Amino acid sequence: DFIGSSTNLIMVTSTTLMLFAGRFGLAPSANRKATAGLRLEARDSGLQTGDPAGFTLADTLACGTVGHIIGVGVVLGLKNIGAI
Amino acid sequence: TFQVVQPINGDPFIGSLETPVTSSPLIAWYLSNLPGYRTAVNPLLRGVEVGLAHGFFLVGPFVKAGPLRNTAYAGSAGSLAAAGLVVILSMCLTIYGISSFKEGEPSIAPSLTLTGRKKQPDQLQTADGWAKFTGGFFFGGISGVTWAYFLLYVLDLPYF
Amino acid sequence: LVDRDPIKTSFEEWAKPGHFSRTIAKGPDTTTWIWNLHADAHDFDSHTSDLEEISRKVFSAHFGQLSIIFLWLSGMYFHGARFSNYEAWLSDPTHIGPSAQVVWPIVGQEILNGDVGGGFRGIQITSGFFQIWRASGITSELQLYCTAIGALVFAALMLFAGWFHYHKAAPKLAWFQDVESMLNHHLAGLLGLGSLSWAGHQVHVSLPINQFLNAGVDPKEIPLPHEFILNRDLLAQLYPSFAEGATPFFTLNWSKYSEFLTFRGGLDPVTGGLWLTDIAHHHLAIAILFLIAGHMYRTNWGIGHGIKDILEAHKGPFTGQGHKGLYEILTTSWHAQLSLNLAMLGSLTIIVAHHMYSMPPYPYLATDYATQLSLFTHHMWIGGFLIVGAAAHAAIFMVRDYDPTNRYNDLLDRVLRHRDAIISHLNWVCIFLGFHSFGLYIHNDTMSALGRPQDMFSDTAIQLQPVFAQWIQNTHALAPGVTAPGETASTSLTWGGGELVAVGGKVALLPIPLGTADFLVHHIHAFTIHVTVLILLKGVLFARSSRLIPDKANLGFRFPCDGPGRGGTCQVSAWDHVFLGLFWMYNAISVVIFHFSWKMQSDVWGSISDQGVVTHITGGNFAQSSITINGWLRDFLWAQASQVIQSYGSSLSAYGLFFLGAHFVWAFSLMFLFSGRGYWQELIESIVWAHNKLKVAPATQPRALSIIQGRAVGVTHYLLGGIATTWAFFLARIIAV
Amino acid sequence: MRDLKTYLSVAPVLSTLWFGSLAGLLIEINRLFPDALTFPF
Amino acid sequence: RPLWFASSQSLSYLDGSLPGDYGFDPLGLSDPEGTGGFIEPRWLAYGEIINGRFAMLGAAGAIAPEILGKAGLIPAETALPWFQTGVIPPAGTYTYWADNYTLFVLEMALMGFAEHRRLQDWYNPGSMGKQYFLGLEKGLAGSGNPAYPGGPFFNPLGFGKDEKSLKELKLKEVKNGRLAMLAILGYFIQGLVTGVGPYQNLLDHLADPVNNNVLTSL
Amino acid sequence: ERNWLRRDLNVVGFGLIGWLAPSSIPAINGKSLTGLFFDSIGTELAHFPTPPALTSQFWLWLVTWHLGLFLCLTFGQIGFKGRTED
Numbered sequence A: 001d002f003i004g005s006s007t008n009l010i011m012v013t014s015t016t017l018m019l020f021a022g023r024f025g026l027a028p029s030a031n032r033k034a035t036a037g038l039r040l041e042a043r044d045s046g047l048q049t050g051d052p053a054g055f056t057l058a059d060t061l062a063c064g065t066v067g068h069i070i071g072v073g074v075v076l077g078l079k080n081i082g083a084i
Numbered sequence B: 001t002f003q004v005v006q007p008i009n010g011d012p013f014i015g016s017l018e019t020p021v022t023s024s025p026l027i028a029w030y031l032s033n034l035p036g037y038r039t040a041v042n043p044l045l046r047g048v049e050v051g052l053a054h055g056f057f058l059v060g061p062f063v064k065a066g067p068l069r070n071t072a073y074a075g076s077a078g079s080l081a082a083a084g085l086v087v088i089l090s091m092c093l094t095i096y097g098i099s100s101f102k103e104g105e106p107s108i109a110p111s112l113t114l115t116g117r118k119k120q121p122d123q124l125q126t127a128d129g130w131a132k133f134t135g136g137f138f139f140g141g142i143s144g145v146t147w148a149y150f151l152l153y154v155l156d157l158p159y160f
Numbered sequence C: 001l002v003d004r005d006p007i008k009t010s011f012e013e014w015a016k017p018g019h020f021s022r023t024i025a026k027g028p029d030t031t032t033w034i035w036n037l038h039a040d041a042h043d044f045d046s047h048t049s050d051l052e053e054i055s056r057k058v059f060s061a062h063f064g065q066l067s068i069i070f071l072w073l074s075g076m077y078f079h080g081a082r083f084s085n086y087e088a089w090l091s092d093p094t095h096i097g098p099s100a101q102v103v104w105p106i107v108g109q110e111i112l113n114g115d116v117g118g119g120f121r122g123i124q125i126t127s128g129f130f131q132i133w134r135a136s137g138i139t140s141e142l143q144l145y146c147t148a149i150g151a152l153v154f155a156a157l158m159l160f161a162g163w164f165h166y167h168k169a170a171p172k173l174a175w176f177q178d179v180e181s182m183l184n185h186h187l188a189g190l191l192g193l194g195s196l197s198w199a200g201h202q203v204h205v206s207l208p209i210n211q212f213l214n215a216g217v218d219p220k221e222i223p224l225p226h227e228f229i230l231n232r233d234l235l236a237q238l239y240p241s242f243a244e245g246a247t248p249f250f251t252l253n254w255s256k257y258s259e260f261l262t263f264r265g266g267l268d269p270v271t272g273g274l275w276l277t278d279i280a281h282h283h284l285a286i287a288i289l290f291l292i293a294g295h296m297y298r299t300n301w302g303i304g305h306g307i308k309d310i311l312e313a314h315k316g317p318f319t320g321q322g323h324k325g326l327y328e329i330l331t332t333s334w335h336a337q338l339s340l341n342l343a344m345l346g347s348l349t350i351i352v353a354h355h356m357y358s359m360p361p362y363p364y365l366a367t368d369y370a371t372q373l374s375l376f377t378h379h380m381w382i383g384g385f386l387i388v389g390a391a392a393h394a395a396i397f398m399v400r401d402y403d404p405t406n407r408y409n410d411l412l413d414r415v416l417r418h419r420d421a422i423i424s425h426l427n428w429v430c431i432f433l434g435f436h437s438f439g440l441y442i443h444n445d446t447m448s449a450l451g452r453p454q455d456m457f458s459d460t461a462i463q464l465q466p467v468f469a470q471w472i473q474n475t476h477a478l479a480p481g482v483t484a485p486g487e488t489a490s491t492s493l494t495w496g497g498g499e500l501v502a503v504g505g506k507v508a509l510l511p512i513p514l515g516t517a518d519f520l521v522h523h524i525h526a527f528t529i530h531v532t533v534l535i536l537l538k539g540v541l542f543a544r545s546s547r548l549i550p551d552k553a554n555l556g557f558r559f560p561c562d563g564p565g566r567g568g569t570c571q572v573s574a575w576d577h578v579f580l581g582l583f584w585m586y587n588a589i590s591v592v593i594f595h596f597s598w599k600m601q602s603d604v605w606g607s608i609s610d611q612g613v614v615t616h617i618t619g620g621n622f623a624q625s626s627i628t629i630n631g632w633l634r635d636f637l638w639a640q641a642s643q644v645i646q647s648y649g650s651s652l653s654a655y656g657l658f659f660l661g662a663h664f665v666w667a668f669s670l671m672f673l674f675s676g677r678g679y680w681q682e683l684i685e686s687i688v689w690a691h692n693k694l695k696v697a698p699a700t701q702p703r704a705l706s707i708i709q710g711r712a713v714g715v716t717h718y719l720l721g722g723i724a725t726t727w728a729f730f731l732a733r734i735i736a737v
Numbered sequence D: 001m002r003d004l005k006t007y008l009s010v011a012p013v014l015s016t017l018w019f020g021s022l023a024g025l026l027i028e029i030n031r032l033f034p035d036a037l038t039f040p041f
Numbered sequence E: 001r002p003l004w005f006a007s008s009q010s011l012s013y014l015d016g017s018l019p020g021d022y023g024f025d026p027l028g029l030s031d032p033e034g035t036g037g038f039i040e041p042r043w044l045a046y047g048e049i050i051n052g053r054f055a056m057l058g059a060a061g062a063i064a065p066e067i068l069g070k071a072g073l074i075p076a077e078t079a080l081p082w083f084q085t086g087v088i089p090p091a092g093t094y095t096y097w098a099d100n101y102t103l104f105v106l107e108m109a110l111m112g113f114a115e116h117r118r119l120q121d122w123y124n125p126g127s128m129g130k131q132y133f134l135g136l137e138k139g140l141a142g143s144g145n146p147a148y149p150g151g152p153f154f155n156p157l158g159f160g161k162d163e164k165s166l167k168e169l170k171l172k173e174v175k176n177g178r179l180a181m182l183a184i185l186g187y188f189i190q191g192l193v194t195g196v197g198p199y200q201n202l203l204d205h206l207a208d209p210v211n212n213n214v215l216t217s218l
Numbered sequence F: 001e002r003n004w005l006r007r008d009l010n011v012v013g014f015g016l017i018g019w020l021a022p023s024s025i026p027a028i029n030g031k032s033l034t035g036l037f038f039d040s041i042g043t044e045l046a047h048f049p050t051p052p053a054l055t056s057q058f059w060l061w062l063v064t065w066h067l068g069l070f071l072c073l074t075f076g077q078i079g080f081k082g083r084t085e086d
Ligand code: CLA
Pocket: C038, C039, C040, C041, C042, C043, C044, C342, C385, C386, C387, C388, C389, C390, C392, C396, C557, C558, C575, C578, C716
């Protein structure tokens, strides 16, 4: 089945991992800017979000896109060499 | 913040700059030990070294690219052409020395080091010094051409 | 942010010429006023010092440019529908010469309507529009008529937009200085979406129609493009993977689309061009890449980059403060942006010209020699002109907009403090290249004249092999299977694989060998380019001051001299350095196009027989004859000019007439270049005397042309004559053979 | 419009109109009577 | 007041004066900075109101004939879906008392009269009640608010006598208009991908929600 | 003007090790870039002093290896020295 297939698992894992990293301060965000030394500096975006940590709709879209890109790359790379 | 390029000797109003190409310790050491920059030595001896080095080199191109390169007379013709070029260069040096310097005048070389110490000006910038330099250069150039020809065509050394 | 109705629409300013300038609006005391009117027409900076007004003026003129381009495209499409033999050519591309222009019989000029095949009489065109339309799936003239109508409508829309955004709603200065948003939109939307849309068109229209055409089907029996969309069964018959729909795309089962998305490489044997499936895959990948790249710069949502922040962080122990301050210069000066964009566009045009000949992207383009030659030469000339304009506007920026008190930048300051070393090193490099490139040709000429062929630099006596380029050719020829396992054939046939593609008895492409002559000609190219770069960079770097004239910035950007003092100061302005670099650009491009023409006619182009033996046009004489100047004079200029000088009485007589006309125009320019103003002003005084005698002296006093105007007229006529002569020679030579 | 009439009397527009009419007249004259080498009347 | 996807920029100019205002403007299209052209707060509100009214007229119209055909009240030759009633002749055509291109001209002329008068009142308030127009200019004077003209013609029943009731009714109008625009977009894209009328789509979904669904339709 | 490089020779070892460690992974059909370069070096020493031919694979491996090595050395110098100036 597609639902239990490896592609489903890999893509869901990548998307959830990127969304987790964005929300819990392990990646850049509308409220967290990387400096030259790869250190996150606090920022105010002016966007009401209704979330305790400040996580915006724009953060969510960006983190989902990054997760999907990584998942697609991994899935195709594994499919090429016959691993999946 | 650290900066590499600096004005020449710290004076920003003289038309030059100090770069790694000009003021590196290795480069500074290498240039100071060439015969043309030994201001405290007899000009004859520096001229002999310069002539030896320059005459030794000239043999190769004339020998290898000359009109008689593919014949049994390659080496002799090349060496003779190199000797002729050395003679022409000696004539040029003599003419320049006659034109530029006047007998009895003091030297026009600078007498200040980069650190401000006073030094004796170079004697190469006088008529007598340039004449000695030219006579050393001619004798050195002829000797170098002869040595190169001897090594290449009297001893069957495994060259190339 | 816009302004409502800033400038009234009226005809009042039309009746007062020179209204844009205070000096010009006074009136024509002399004839210099008329010339001053046209030279300063588009210099918006001199008109007003307000940046917002200049930006508003600049924005509207681009709409007029787009309208003119759309009108030109509409005309090109209409002439193919009404005055062409496209439908006859579509049934036999190899035996019919394309034609889209016809002439009225008036003074005997109907002789220009020579035969071209397909029962048509007209002028043969070399723009390559037929191949473009064929690759798009266009079959009938109705589609071309519709395209022309649409282009006319778009031209009208562009004109209306140009009027509107200047007279009804003009954007504010803050709108123009939003570079992050402009970059994001131009990357993601203008380029990425355009590439995606073209990929979709190629997938749904070009592939099936071109497959039907390549199969040999009559163009009138091919189904219409919309039938492939409404009837998925037809596409499934052509491509079985279309039966699964878009399900493989969303399940990451992309391998199912391998039928129409390939990575083959090489050329299509039937048509002699690139595979269209490769082009569709290329456009899809490029669209994805540009769509991703358009999300880099920061906007209202906080995520992204700040260009100023990126610039400020790049500094080193050799450069001091680095790129800090470059953001303010490039957001307040129109000239610097224009110079940068002109340089990049010219380089891109030259790259495009080089790339289109070795990887022919259109069907039946490689075997149409005239189209290939024309496209190469056209794009080379365009690139050269744009590159020269880049330096011109860089000098203009240096003269006008440079202000260290408010716009300091460390990188620009450091360049200006050691310009003598740069110029001296470039001078030495130019002298060395000139001695060691052109001198080898003179040595060859002397040795050949003296009767000593064994002392020449040639493939038989003294070889100068370009071993670096041969290594690159070998590396690219063996790439498939080693460093590019996914490729089937090499990127181009010129790398030296050993295969030959022949279409209709002619040679399309084959490996191109390199030898002693290529070494010499490449170093000639390097020498000419280096000299041109010397003249332009000297002109830019010494625009403000020098040891000769310390106050040069006060005299302006375009002034003739500073008098006969200091031994003489003719041609010290930055304008004169562009005037002198135009001549060297012309020289370099002429040499490049001559090299291309001779090499193609000698080693590539030709006819193929049944047994497989190739007979090139000139018989492979480039290797042994091009190593001397006498060879270029005899076997290239003397031999290949017989077509243009014997064209009288045939359909090619227009080229013969243009040959002599361009000769006359070129020679006519030397009067303005070798003479000076004072003679002509003194001569006019005597002519005015006799007009006063007969009461016919004009109230607008005649004046001789200025020093700058004379220089400009001379260079313009010189370039026009030379380029037109070469154009006529090339076309007359290549259409006949 | 007075200003529109003024713009039609400027030198380039007037010269263009005059030369266009002149060229048309000459073209029609050479179309009606082609290949004139002598004045036969 | 309740808020819906509000931001610091959007709340600086959406202070609650307009009816049905929740501070929703992520793109900042109604920012009063440098208003010009058609991007202007007043024009945007007027356009929203007019589009809502027209969509509300259209949303019920595109489905009223279809449901009565399946209810057996109107003849089956008139119970056509909205895309086979003459709007798109390639999809289907119905023969009326005049050819379609002839009806278009009459519709164009009448709508031109009405819309030109509306626009000229927008430009110059109270201008339409001045020049003689068959004696109908007495009631077409407007009220100074372009979106709510009132009067004996546009407010016959005299509803909204009280200002609080008028505000509540304006809010209800805005909500219903937005819902109707959403329904019209649903009409279009449902017709695109299913190829059959929206009422039949609803009946299909009601018959079996799992086999007749987006997962099975796309 | 003296000691312009701010000499720190630890960079040479760190850069060399940080290039030799990842480049030794045999991801190229069971072979590594360093391994391929070393085998090419061994093959071309069998006909000393005759130089490698134009069609030999030695030049490609040489250039590709030294590109990465020089990148590692340059970035190591920049990183070591830049820690104290920023
Ligand atoms: C996108 C390209 C672009 C743009 C927007 C500009 C814009 C500008 N340039 Mg420019 N330039 C460009 C490319 C460009 N350039 C290139 C590529 C070059 C190198 C050749 C130059 C070289 C250049 C110089 C040397 C100068 C400018 C100047 C200027 C400014 C004033 C221009 C003016 O008044 O024109 C006036 C336009 C004309 C006089 C028309 C010229 C007509 C040409 C030369 C002949 C055409 C022959 C024609 C076919 C015959 C038919 C004639 C007909 C009557 C029958 C303006 C800001 C000037 C400036 O800034 O001064 C401070 C200036 O001096 N430019």
